[PDB]
Design an enzyme around this catalytic site. Sequence first.
Site, short mmCIF file in Angstrom:
data_model
loop_
_atom_site.label_atom_id
_atom_site.label_comp_id
_atom_site.label_asym_id
_atom_site.label_seq_id
_atom_site.Cartn_x
_atom_site.Cartn_y
_atom_site.Cartn_z
N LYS C 189 -11.43 0.10 29.48
CA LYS C 189 -11.04 0.43 30.84
C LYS C 189 -12.09 1.34 31.48
CE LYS C 189 -9.26 2.68 34.33
NZ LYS C 189 -9.87 3.92 34.90
N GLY C 242 -13.99 12.20 29.33
CA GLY C 242 -13.79 12.62 30.70
C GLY C 242 -13.44 14.09 30.81
N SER C 243 -12.45 14.39 31.63
CA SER C 243 -12.05 15.77 31.88
C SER C 243 -11.00 16.24 30.88
CB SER C 243 -11.52 15.93 33.30
OG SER C 243 -10.31 15.21 33.47
N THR C 244 -10.89 17.55 30.73
CA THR C 244 -9.90 18.16 29.84
C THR C 244 -8.48 17.86 30.32
OG1 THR C 244 -11.34 19.96 29.03
CG2 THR C 244 -8.96 20.36 29.02
N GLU C 265 -13.10 13.23 24.29
CA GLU C 265 -14.37 13.89 24.56
C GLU C 265 -14.30 14.52 25.95
OE1 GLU C 265 -17.58 13.38 22.78
OE2 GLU C 265 -16.70 12.25 21.11
#
Lengths: 495, 495, 495, 497
Positions: C189, C242-244, C265
């Site tokens: 995706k 991506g983001s936390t 990650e």
Amino acid sequence: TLTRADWEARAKDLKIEGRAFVNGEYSNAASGETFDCLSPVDGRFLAKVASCDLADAEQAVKVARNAFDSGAWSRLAPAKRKQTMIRFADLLLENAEELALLETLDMGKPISDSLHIDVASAANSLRWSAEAIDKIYDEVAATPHAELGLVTREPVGVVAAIVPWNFPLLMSCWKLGPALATGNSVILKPSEKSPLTAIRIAQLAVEAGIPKGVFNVLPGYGHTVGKALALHMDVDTLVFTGSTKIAKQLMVYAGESNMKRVWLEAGGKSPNIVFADAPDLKAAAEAAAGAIAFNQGEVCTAGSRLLVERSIKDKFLPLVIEALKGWKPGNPLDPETNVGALVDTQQMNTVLSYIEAGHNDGAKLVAGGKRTLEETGGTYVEPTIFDGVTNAMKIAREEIFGPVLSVIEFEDAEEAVRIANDTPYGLAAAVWTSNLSKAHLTAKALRAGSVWVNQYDGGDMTAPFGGFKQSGNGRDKSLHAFDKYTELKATWIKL
Amino acid sequence: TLTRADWEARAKDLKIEGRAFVNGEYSNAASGETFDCLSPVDGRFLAKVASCDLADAEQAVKVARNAFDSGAWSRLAPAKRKQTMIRFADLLLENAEELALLETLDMGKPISDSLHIDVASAANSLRWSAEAIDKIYDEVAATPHAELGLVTREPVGVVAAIVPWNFPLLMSCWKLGPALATGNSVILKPSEKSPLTAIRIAQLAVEAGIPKGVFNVLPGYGHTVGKALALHMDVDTLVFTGSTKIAKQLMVYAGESNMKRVWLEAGGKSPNIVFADAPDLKAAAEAAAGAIAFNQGEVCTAGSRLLVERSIKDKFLPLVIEALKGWKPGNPLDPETNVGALVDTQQMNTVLSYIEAGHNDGAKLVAGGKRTLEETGGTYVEPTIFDGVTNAMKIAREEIFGPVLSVIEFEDAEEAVRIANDTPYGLAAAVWTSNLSKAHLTAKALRAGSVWVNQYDGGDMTAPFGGFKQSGNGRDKSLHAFDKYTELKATWIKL
Amino acid sequence: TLTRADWEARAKDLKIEGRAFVNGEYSNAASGETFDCLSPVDGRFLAKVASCDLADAEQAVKVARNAFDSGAWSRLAPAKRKQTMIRFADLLLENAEELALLETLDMGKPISDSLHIDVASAANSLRWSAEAIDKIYDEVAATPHAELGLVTREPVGVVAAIVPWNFPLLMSCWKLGPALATGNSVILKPSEKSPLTAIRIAQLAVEAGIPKGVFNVLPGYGHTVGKALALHMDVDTLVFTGSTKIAKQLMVYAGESNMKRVWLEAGGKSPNIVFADAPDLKAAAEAAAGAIAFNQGEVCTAGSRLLVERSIKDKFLPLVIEALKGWKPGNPLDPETNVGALVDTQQMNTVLSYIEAGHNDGAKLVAGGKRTLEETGGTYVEPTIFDGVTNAMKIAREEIFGPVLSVIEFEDAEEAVRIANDTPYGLAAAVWTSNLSKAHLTAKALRAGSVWVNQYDGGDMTAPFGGFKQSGNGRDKSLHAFDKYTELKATWIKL
Amino acid sequence: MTTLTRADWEARAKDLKIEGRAFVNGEYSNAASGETFDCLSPVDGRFLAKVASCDLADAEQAVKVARNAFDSGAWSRLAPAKRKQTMIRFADLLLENAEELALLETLDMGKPISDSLHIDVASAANSLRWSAEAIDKIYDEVAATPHAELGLVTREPVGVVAAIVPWNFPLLMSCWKLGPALATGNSVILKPSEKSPLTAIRIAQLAVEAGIPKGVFNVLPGYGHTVGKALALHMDVDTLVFTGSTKIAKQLMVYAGESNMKRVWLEAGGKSPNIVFADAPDLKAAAEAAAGAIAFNQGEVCTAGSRLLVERSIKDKFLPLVIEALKGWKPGNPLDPETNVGALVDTQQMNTVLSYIEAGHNDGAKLVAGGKRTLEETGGTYVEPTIFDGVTNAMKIAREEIFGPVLSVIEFEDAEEAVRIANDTPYGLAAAVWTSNLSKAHLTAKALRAGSVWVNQYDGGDMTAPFGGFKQSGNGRDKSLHAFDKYTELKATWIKL
Ligand SMILES: [K+]
Ligand SMILES: [K+]
Ligand SMILES: [K+]
Ligand SMILES: [K+]
């Protein structure tokens, strides 16, 4: 802590076994012949040690082979062999004081070093190898789905071990550890200059649970029983530590017999490189002095060639001599003694001959250089430093195996490496610098099995120990030591 | 796809190189002397091949040493060495038919075997070792917090390679692969019975990007150039595959010289054990026939001892005989030929002399047993089966290196294992059964470097290949092959 | 070497695919809905990309599950998967210019970066993983003789991969490589901000030999199709970069569904520590500027926090400002552009919002700080440096994901370490010094998955990549990435 | 010679002084609120001790303590050889207190005393010892890099580890976690089950005596929905490891996503299939193993052989052998050394087991052994080992984990159907195959989606065997060297030279 008077008292009240150990029993040689075990401390008589030959070796191999095939040890559960060898290690600590005294009297090492270094490391070497038995994993290859590929390790069978005299107990345990852990039968041939420790531990092994005929000790000379084992057609592997001369002959013996695997730890001329940007020149000085004075310079990785950058040589050299003041040749039965006795008369004469070769080569003696303590009837030599030594001189090329230090100058990092590699040896080397890049790039450039940065004689049981080129092959200690006593098998199964 | 006429046409228009390859260029021997290279296909002339000697070996070592010291290959990035070696592998595929034709003419094996098996496997061997270069990791020991313990591997330097004649290209690449991948300089010495493919690929290596002097080829005789490399004081490692006698002699040369590392792979008398409960007796019969007929029985792991359980011996024996009919000795340049010629007259006489020994031992000849295709001018022999053989007979204990099979009966699993292990060899073995416990327990009990279950001649580049006992030491293929060309260094850094 | 006019011409004449790729075929979303894929280069329209949702996930999973169960890829020989994935890599290179153009147009990074860095690395990442397949060995335990203990790795099955927009193609192959190599089916995706390259290589996979249904691509939004995959009951493993904040939601989704394995990650706030005794201060400044300017600062391991020692700060800072001037925002389709556009308007507003936050915190703008090239219709922000930043300020703690540098200073090594570890992140860090002990002891003290000494953004495919704490779990690259897509099995067989 | 009897163990029970306080920072202490819960025994319902009932305040305090101990480096930066030596003494101390720890086990959760002493304590001590021995045998990596570059790949302890352990193997499961976690240099906060807190409370003191520094190993007894939830949601807990049910395991994973994205390693429920083929080496031995696979530890085993898959051609001859072998497993007084089957952990667990048995009848399965509550007059909770015949893999008792001595017998036609039935489950913790055929043993083992596959034996593998589940049976592995990876982070140090 025991007093000097206590050690001498125990030295007199000390019953010493001198018989061989075969099939779980102490016995004499087939010929019944015997050599005298002399102490280099004061030339005293210790015991009469069995002098084995071909007949004893043939008997020991049959016993070892039968014990291996029985499976009492070779097919015993890994976790059980671990517990047995740990008890073996524990028994070495329980009889530590006797073992230390035996060794000191045998080859002359200070009693403090025999108890706190020799015996302590010997038990640790057995224990570490035992703890590692069931931590090792073999391999499964990436194969097609309808196939299974196994890569496993198996004990070679009968292993012959020839141990030197500088660290008789420790070197024995460096060999015994992995060899017994892998489940092999071992025939131990100790040095004729120091057979007592090997003889004593053979009984300790059986008490620990090692089945009869798995660990055998054959005291004697190298040209007799040692030669017999190296030429035997049923010995699968021979491991050795000693001189390059003898190690070369052992490899020939293998080529003449049964193509047996040979793993050798020869001598060395380990360079100790000191740069100007060393973190602490004092610490480096103490180390450089200790690297040649410890165990009377009778160490395979002795820092014989001290390489110093010209920028600091005028400051560094006085510090080395000042540091060498503390290494006194004294009575090996005194705990306070730093430096003990050489192994025998022949060794001293050889060391003194090199000291003589030092002057004749045009080297400037700046410390020691003479025989000492002759009134004791013992074999003692004071620490010796030769200045102005170039790497072309005889005392820089050949291994003295005594407390004799060669100091050599270098211009830059390139020359230091050139000089360090200018040798047929390659057992160890050291680098002293605070610069990140130079420390790593030098250590990579050096052709030595062990490179010590900002220290000397480092590394424990986790560090593989061995040499490049003519310093030998294979590695002692670490998990790599196990590879010398095992054979790889590729079992490919079609499903 | 190419017919018989095609290969025979290409063989007449083939221009064959016969010079040695030193420092990126073809060159005659220093003496200018050569030897004739003949084809065992029909005794035809191929080319004059340079007969190198001590002087040539002396030159190549310095060339190899200088190439290694320059760092053009030894200090090239691992990923870049990978790319080059892969390019090397690709070049073998591009010149596949020429290399196959050279191999067939040189030593006699069928052209279809040379092309589809030898060249393919050799290229794969190089590519696999190349792919493995940057996938191997060294070690960092568990140390105290203020210390870093590095355990790494470095190329030994100059590596000498003595290669057999039964698989000239493949055995060369089994050595070249890991030796070049680790960054060593290699001096290849091909068999005097088959030097052509080794000469040819030396040109392909430099075309691929291998720097000059890194890979050198010196044709000649073992007692001249081979002996010189084995005795050279600047050669770090020697690898070899051949006879036990020569292998034993090479180990002596090392002990006499510089104590160089020696890795040998000798002969074998591999037992092929077929139990009653084998999954498929027919398939086992086909494999049993192939295990002795493939490559004219000139195979180290040839199934020369067929061990059959007594209860199925009367049914399984005819199946093997019927299956052996499928392997007809014929014209090696014909694609349909599955059995080629023997390497030379002397090899044929050795095989014929063992067949005579078969009769004199009392064994019953049930297949082949004679020399064939004499009118062709080439050396050929019929695939041979002997029945009623005991493990005490001459043909059962000694390696024949021909298509001569010994059939031995056993009662149960215990006897089979005993008969199998009753040999000075230990290179390979095979077990045929459908029982879980019996398959694994037998495979564990066999003393062979390779144990194949329900198949013969199994294992790819992931399967380590070597011998127990007098079949040799060290392993080819897998990641373990790399260890024969590297040295362990323990770098302990004080922080 | 193509010119700016060349790329701009190819851009206008480029036909773009925007459909999903399920079961080996391109197709629209089930709802037929799409979203407009716009370029941050100049705001131009590129393509209508399929906007997938729940129904597409449910279909893709079934397809992926059936493909896995059929064993067409999951039970294909390891060497065959290797060869196929190598062809996959080659197809990326054969379409490099096309892929690079898509990447640049999609998310705005310079064309030279897309081509010579991103595509080249993506193909290498795939190639390296492929080469590693048959180099990995599973384990055989040390067990009693009558037992066989295997420890093997099997593919998990269906893997869902949610990749970011900053490195669309490279991050994809970081997941695809080890996931496909181990035999899994993958549903990829791509970010809605950069779906183009993922859509393209899907067709390249099947051309290479990847079976249909094994590699699927579902373009769309994270809150629609990403959420459906994360909540799907038949997805075995979810990997993400991506983001936390998003990573936390996914971990919740897994806990709500089938407890699928989640490998994340997340973001980072990497400290770039420069000591006074750095080897090259010019190189350190050049690297520091590139650490924040490269890929428009849209790098999770960007040196957003520059740590300079007090005794060199006043001399080091102007060097950083001067070095940063080489990084000029401009036309991404121009080969000489080194700083491209931010991904979209939302990202630009976010970055500009943090620049205003820097002013609010009391920091000093000493370089850049403004939006640029507004006339082009694209979204560009010039490289920005804030001086006088403390670790308490908002711009020092929160990830900006833009070319905004925070310069913080420290007194000694202890304070540097304290400030560096004073963050919820732990993805990367760098240390610049020439001292041996300080380099290693600082590196060991830093809580970061990657630590680069005397360089920045180091490590190839041999180096594992991931974060401590809230930077994520698990590692990409190296051999360790394979473990995220396999399960351990312990098969204990009683003999 | 001497022999401990039932009366001897009972007398030891009345003498035994039982500690019930939490253990934080090297000292015993109550909960901050001072609240406690009554620790009762399933042996006879007797009162054992008042155990501290910790909550958020205690979790916060323990984490701060654990954090400070880790940062101080008293344990985390201690030499590997010295951590090894300390944990061996810890292992030896468990052995020197084996009888007391075993008695604490039996009284707490009801398993037979012979099991607590000879299996649990012995294995738990060996698990600590093994993990200790392995510390300095593990090597980190050096990558193949260009010459002027050094690439180190090393492992480092995560820091603060929260461990939530179940009640079925309280001491053993504790040491499966404590072993690798403490060996790697982490600080650990152990939250034992509220059904069995005593042994965890005890060994905490023993760790300190062995040399483990203060605050490195803490024990917080209490409920999972209080202190357990608190540890899962804490922002300074680096790693959470857990063994228990699938439901709770899922919940903890949510807490991690809601908090600080802490690493989460779980070992959930299971429904392990025990597959017996016609060509099994020993049908009698397989029958004994099958009975033991469901009766051992009152069936309260994660990897209990709860599904017995039997080939149809031998079903009529194999089943009677299993029924006969089950008779050897009799529920009795856990304090009697001769007892092989003890009590269920509590009344709630008993009712659940009884509820599943009733569900077995309702699904239409045929009861062929046990099926009733027993020894009710003792005041303790006991249930007979139960076998249901004629079960399909769709019935409730075949798909759901029972965690009691209830066996489901399922028939299959061939190996293909056997693998299908065995894999038809949300779990995948363990499986077994009985056959003498080489090909069928390996191919089936490779086809079974389970973390542990046992061939021609049950409950195999020592400390060298990784232990964990596929799918919803959890993630990560206990035991072996693989266990260490759950408590360390990878660091790639690339040094330019
Ligand atoms: K002596
Ligand atoms: K020839
Ligand atoms: K876009
Ligand atoms: K209780």
